[PDB]
Amino acid sequence: PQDMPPPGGYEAVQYKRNLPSRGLFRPRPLLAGAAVLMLYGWYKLVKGIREQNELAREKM
């Protein structure tokens, strides 16, 4: 026999465009989490510089 398809034919393949939006790359959560990092970082910075200026007062 020659090279034929199987009796019922092959099952469908995937060809339609498939680029599904993933929550890892959405501009709301990224902006929000950026704001939390950026606001906490300034919080620690206020503590740090306030302590360093006091450390500077003792050295003087």
Binding site: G48, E51, E58, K59
Partner: protein, 169 residues
């Protein structure tokens, strides 16, 4: 000689000539940098008036302070030798424990807080002298009595506690 910081200094000049007999002799302080920083807040707590008197004399004779305020300078040297002797005869181990840590830590006080909190309580109960830093913010706990030092490379140990005079354990 000039107060300019040198950039091309390849030589040093000395002067073996001694101060004239008319000027009273004072044995100079023999302590080095790390011991003097560990005793500074105790020099201040005992010799403030003498330190303050020297500087007010110099500001009273502008351009002539070096020659006309010599008695005050001898008085500060003597006053500051008294604390050094007192710390030696009563806090010798703790004092060495502190300024040796300071020598290994870039002379940064925040880097040797557990040794200061021991030396300070020995000085307070023996020489009755107490470290005071003016204009520290009132809301915040003083930085030399803070349990956690943020700029210290080795974290202050939980067991080691800060020393506040007039408070028991």
């Amino acid at each position: 000689m000039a107060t300019r910081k040198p950039a091309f200094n390849q030589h040093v000049l000395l002067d073996t000539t001694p101060l004239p007999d008319s000027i009273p002799k004072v044995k100079e302080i023999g302590a080095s940098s790390a011991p003097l920083l560990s005793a500074s807040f105790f020099i201040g707590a005992r010799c403030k008036d003498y330190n303050d008197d020297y500087m007010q004399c110099k500001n009273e004779n502008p351009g002539r302070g070096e020659f006309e305020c010599l008695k005050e300078g001898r008085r500060v040297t003597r006053c500051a030798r008294s604390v050094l002797k007192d710390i030696n005869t009563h806090c010798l181990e703790q004092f060495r424990a502190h300024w040796q840590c300071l020598d290994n830590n870039n002379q940064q006080l925040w880097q040797c807080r557990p040794a200061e909190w021991k030396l300070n309580k020995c000085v307070y109960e023996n020489l009755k002298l107490e470290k005071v830093i003016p204009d520290q913010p009132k809301n915040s706990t003083p930085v030399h009595l803070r349990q956690r030092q943020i700029f210290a490379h080795h974290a202050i140990p939980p067991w080691e506690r800060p020393f506040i005079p007039g408070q028991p354990e």
